[PDB]
């Protein structure tokens, strides 16, 4: 377990899923080449931008204590314990998965230090009676289930199946989806859950249990990334081809369709409404394993991505600028979270130190309660690295969440040379779909896959 620490006047924590789910041997195995590393580097880039920003903490240089959660609650809680060892840092911009953020908030509220998540959308995190020193730039996931139900009603998918992961993300997501589908005349065929320590055989059995109902031609997903990938692989191995409805776990991630791009074609997924940062790409492409010794996880990711071997010094010519780079739907959220923490610290400084620029005697002990209260209300700023067209700004509501907006993607272009997603609509206090971009939804190509108990029999002869 390696520690990444920066130097600054006041240090803030962070917990990023740099490594993937822990295997049976070690606590965590492979490196998240797209979620953990990219979000970590985006947080580092935004911190470097704030440290060079004269309007946001000009004289106060804020540091970092970013760590790896290893996609597991045990390792995440151990890193949060390493965080709270000082009070046993000021804030924590950390927590991707739901249960990770849950345990981190449980441990941090115990020491009264705030936390601004960037990927955990669980609804139970909005409970301020249980997690009061917690916030997030991503909105909760109970109206995300509303968007999924509205999409299902748009295509008249009544008899649908459900699949999710155990914990705090899949359970609440499935509950919200069922509550919003019972009100939209959409039925649940099979209500199931998947575990954390899984295998290929378990997902094959899950696909077999979902295949015994041929009427459920579509299954909604509230799983994580690895669970969705394993489910897609099991459906591809069992020759099961049916459209999916994915949550933020899959989203627009290309590592889920890695190898199983056939069984994932025409799957309507829902991701968070964001935008690609025009400056984070230039930062990540200019990264090298030798000029970025600040992060050893970056060296490990470089070694595991390009099939490198630092004991062989062979890949001294590779670079990120040569390979194609694609951001995420959460990089905007991690930069918004760190910028909101920085704006909160700046407002607290200008309120408690209205004369000087550096920290004062009343500022060195950072009170987490007053910091969180000054953050939830005295934070309203245009989103950093925002395009000139949109007017998006970071505003935390009464529950410390973000505005409710989602994008709807679909997997198309079965050609092996252009494997990609396609944004077909946006959900913002209402449903908006453009079926002209979906291949199977267009009537010229063919009818849409229906999922109902029985056929819509005509009233002329047969009654209902």
């Amino acid at each position, epitope marked *: 377990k390696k520690v990444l620490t920066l130097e600054g006047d006041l240090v803030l924590g962070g917990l990023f899923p740099v490594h993937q789910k822990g295997g049976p041997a070690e606590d965590c195995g492979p490196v998240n080449e797209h979620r953990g590393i990219q979000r970590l580097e985006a947080m580092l880039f935004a911190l470097d931008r704030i440290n060079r920003d004269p309007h946001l903490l000009p004289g106060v240089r804020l540091g970092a204590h970013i760590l790896d959660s290893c996609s597991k609650d045990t390792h995440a809680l151990e890193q949060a314990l390493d965080f709270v060892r000082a009070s046993l840092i000021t804030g924590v911009i950390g927590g991707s998965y739901s249960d990770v953020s849950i345990q981190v908030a449980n441990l941090l509220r115990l020491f009264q230090i705030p936390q601004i998540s960037y990927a955990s959308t669980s609804a139970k995190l909005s409970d*301020k009676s249980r997690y009061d020193y917690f916030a997030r730039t991503v909105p909760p996931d*109970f*109206f995300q289930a509303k968007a999924m139900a509205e999409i299902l009603r748009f295509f008249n998918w009544t008899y649908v199946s459900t699949v999710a992961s155990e914990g705090d993300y899949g359970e609440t997501g499935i509950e*919200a989806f069922e509550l919003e589908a019972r009100a939209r005349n959409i039925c649940v065929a099979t209500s199931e859950k998947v575990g954390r320590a899984m295998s290929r055989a378990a997902f094959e059995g899950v696909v077999r249990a979902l295949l015994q109902k041929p009427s459920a031609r579509v299954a909604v997903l509230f799983t994580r990334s690895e669970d969705a990938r394993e489910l897609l692989a099991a459906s591809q191995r069992l020759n099961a081809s049916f459209t999916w409805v994915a949550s933020d776990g899959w989203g627009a991630l290309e590592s889920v369709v890695a190898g199983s791009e056939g069984a994932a074609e025409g799957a309507i997924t829902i991701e968070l409404a964001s935008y690609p940062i025009s400056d984070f790409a230039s930062y990540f492409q200019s990264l090298d394993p030798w000029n970025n010794s600040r992060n050893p996880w970056f060296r490990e990711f470089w070694e595991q991505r390009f099939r490198c071997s630092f004991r062989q010094r062979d890949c001294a010519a590779h670079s990120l600028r040569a390979v194609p780079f694609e951001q995420e739907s959460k990089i905007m959220f991690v930069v918004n979270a760190v910028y909101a923490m920085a704006h909160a610290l700046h407002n607290m400084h200008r309120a408690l130190c209205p004369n000087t620029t550096r920290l004062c005697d009343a500022m060195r002990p950072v009170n987490g309660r007053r910091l969180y209260k000054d953050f939830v209300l005295n934070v309203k700023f245009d989103a950093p690295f925002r395009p000139a067209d949109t007017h998006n700004e970071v505003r935390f509501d*009464r*529950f410390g969440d973000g505005i409710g907006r989602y994008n709807i993607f679909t997997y198309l272009r079965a050609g092996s040379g252009r494997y990609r997603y396609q944004k077909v609509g946006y959900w913002a206090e209402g449903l908006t779909l453009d079926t002209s971009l979906i291949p199977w939804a267009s009537p010229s190509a063919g009818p849409l896959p229906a999922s109902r108990c029985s056929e819509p029999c005509l009233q002329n002869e047969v009654k209902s």
Partner: nanobody, 117 residues
Framework: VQLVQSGGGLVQAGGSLRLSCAAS????????MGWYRQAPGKQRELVAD???????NYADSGKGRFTISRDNAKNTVYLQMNRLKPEDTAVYYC????????????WGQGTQVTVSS
């Protein structure tokens, strides 16, 4: 949902008082909203409640008192102190019932309502 309260007041016996309790909609169907009273370290007692449909109930000693009025537009409940007494020195709270897979009740902050001689 979050429950905000206003109108604490420090009045004597036989005076008038208005306690308002508001909430946030958040596209949630709050089906019941009422008031409660309790002392620090004791049990809570209902004093007034409305199910947003006309059914209104009170406490056993406040049948003719604790006039309440609510509306489904702003989701706000207003209570009036009809007749005061030195026995209601406890702090008051307002609750809101929302049914989203939990059937949970959301409470509010404390409002000090005390009546002296």
């Amino acid at each position: 949902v979050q429950l905000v309260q206003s109108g604490g007041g420090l009045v004597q016996a036989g005076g008038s008082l208005r306690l308002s309790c508001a909430a946030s909609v958040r596209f949630f169907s709050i089906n019941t909203m009422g008031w409660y009273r309790q002392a620090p370290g004791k049990q809570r007692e209902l004093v007034a409640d409305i199910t947003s449909s006309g059914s209104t109930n009170y406490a056993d000693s406040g049948k003719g008192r604790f006039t309440i009025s609510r509306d489904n537009a702003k989701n706000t409940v207003y209570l009036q102190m009809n007749r005061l007494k030195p026995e209601d020195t406890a702090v008051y709270y307002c609750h809101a019932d929302y049914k989203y897979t939990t059937h949970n009740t959301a409470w509010g902050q404390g409002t000090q309502v005390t009546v002296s001689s």
